[PDB]
């Protein structure tokens with residue numbers, strides 16, 4: 307079954323998604339979004355918690371499916387702490403880039419997912435002895451996912467700075483780790 311980190315991320319995203327349905331999207335964003343006013347700059351959770359918010363059923367479903375699979379794999383083969391760090395780094399960096407180009411009103415675990423895609427792949431392709439890799443078939447679907455993000459094929463208004471920054475981060479960490 308899914309490790310503790312894989313699990314708590316999924317439950318946290320579900321809990322937050324429920325709150326967004328009950329209270330509305332904007333209201334939850336007041337609390338969890340990247341700082342949108344200078345008065346909010348020291349509320350350090352916001353640099354990360356944007357990743358917990360999803361704006362539709364499909365948004366959350368596909369993110370959690372990928373997270374469940376890729377995150378679960380990282381945790382099992384490389385440990386909980388490693389998944390934690392990939393998650394914090396990709397969340398922080400993807401938010402930063404997204405914000406830079408589009409402002410603070412955004413959310414979604416997809417920055418982390420793309421990081422996990424790049425990470426699991428490059429790490430298997432450069433350090434097979436790590437005991438983790440992205441199976442041939444899933445490489446294909448990962449690529450399609452990336453293509454869909456890049457060309458805005460999801461039918462989402464959300465921009466896609468988060469997407470490329472996430473992938474770049476995952477690749478970079480795999481590089482460093484395979485050394």
Ligand SMILES: *C(=O)c1cc(N)ccc1[C@@H](*)C(=O)OC
Pocket residue numbers: 365369404412413414415416417455460462464465466467468469
């Ligand atoms: C994904 O979670 C996400 C998040 C943000 N902030 C911007 C874009 C995207 C793209 C996406 O949902 O790809 C699936």
